[PDB]
Structure 1
Amino acid sequence: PPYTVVYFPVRGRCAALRMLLADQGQSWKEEVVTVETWQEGSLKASCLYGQLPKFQDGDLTLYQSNTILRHLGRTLGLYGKDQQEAALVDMVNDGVEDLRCKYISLIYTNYEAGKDDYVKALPGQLKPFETLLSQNQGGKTFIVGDQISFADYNLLDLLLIHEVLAPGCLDAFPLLSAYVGRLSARPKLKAFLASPEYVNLPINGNGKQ
């Protein structure tokens, strides 16, 4: 640290890393980028891949949400207990990322027309995570191992936003359902999820969810 999150006034790709920081008792600064500032071009041009989030950790400047998650993950000890667990954490996170990309595609590309189809395919997309849970202490702890990892936060956010998109989409998945309520119940996390900082921010930037 100190940590600084440079992003638009949305939860989006910063929601999970924010939950991580909050739950780990970390302090950070939120640098909010309005549309006007982005449309002007200066900031965008300075970003490596021309996109936000931009993360500051002392003298270290990072880009890419998953790079930030892995950074906070290895640095804060939320990346598995060993190399094998670390690989499992990656496999989970990679899966979460694939579905997030499909979700964002729906939201920004063809929400109205493609929504029903997306919802039909959803259970097949959630299945893998339910399976992962059933293989780890009967799904009573975390997604990988007995300790929480950055993949847990990313998975939790994914499940939360999909529940807003299709309420009750977790009803057919017992372990996933229980996993969300359990994680969401974590003191520092519960406090964050209920805060104006989280609640008063739209999930996405186009008003859809």
Structure 2
Amino acid sequence: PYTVVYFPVRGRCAALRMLLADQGQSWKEEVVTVETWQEGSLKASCLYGQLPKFQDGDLTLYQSNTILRHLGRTLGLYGKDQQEAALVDMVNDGVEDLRCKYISLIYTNYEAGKDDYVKALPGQLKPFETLLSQNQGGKTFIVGDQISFADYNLLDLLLIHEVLAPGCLDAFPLLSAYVGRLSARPKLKAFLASPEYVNLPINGNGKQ
């Protein structure tokens, strides 16, 4: 079945985990500790010397977005046609761009850059609110009327940002309702409330 190999943090696996759970999929968690990593063995066997590492049968994958896309392709969470597929990518790419800045803050200069980051947030979130207003008034999903991997990724982005800047979604009604709505999905809700998710720090340096 599936197996996600990662450190004991949500980080870049949070979204794909939400997806699997929400899709009623089963997966094995291979937890890697700082000690096991600093040993070098696993690091060397990784294509880009990094985790997450993913296994689907004998198919070994690396890169969180490759996992996301893979799951979306095989599970039918990639749009109804080529057009929607492109729109899904567009959203995911934007999520990725913002996640990189987030990651950079968290690990590069949390204390010095938090203010500037939070000041810039509105403008970084605005694109997703706009996307929402152009798709059935933000009533359904980020693209089309069926959920996609971009949704789970955007949801996570949103969630981690609420922790970073409590209330950053107040100025974005569609996003706020979107988070609540998605978070309310039965399987997802149960997952999000489970110790498996709740007891994992968002990041590995203790900053959030």
- Give TM-score scaled by structure 1 length: 0.99
Could you tell me how far apart the structure 2 residues matched to 1:155 and 1:136 are?
15
After superposition, the CA RMSD in angstroms is 0.2
Alpha-carbon distance in structure 1 between the residues aligned to 2:87 and 2:101: 22
Residues 46-104 of structure 1 show CA distances to partners (whole Å, capped at 9, x for unaligned) of 00000000000001000000000000000000000000000000000000000000000
3-state SS of paired residue (1:6): strand
What are structure 2's unaligned runs of at least 5 residues? none
Q: Secondary structure at the match of 1:13?
A: helix
Q: Deviations over 1:148-193 (max 9, x none)?
A: 0000000000000000000000000000000000000000000000
Q: CA deviation at 1:142?
A: 0.1
Query: Is residue 49 of structure 2 the alignment partner of residue 56 of structure 1?
Result: no
Percent same amino acid at aligned positions? 100
Q: Separation in 2 of the partners of 1:172 and 1:115?
A: 19
Q: Distance in 1 between matches of 2:170 and 2:202?
A: 22
Q: Distance in 2 between matches of 1:59 and 1:208?
A: 35
Partner of 2:154: 155
Count of aligned pairs between the two proteins: 208
Task: Map 1:1-150 onto structure 2 (within 5 A).
Answer: 2-150=1-149
Query: Which TM-score applies when normalising by structure 2?
Result: 1.00
Unpaired runs of 5+ residues, structure 1, are none
Q: Which runs of 4+ in 1 moved over 4 A?
A: none
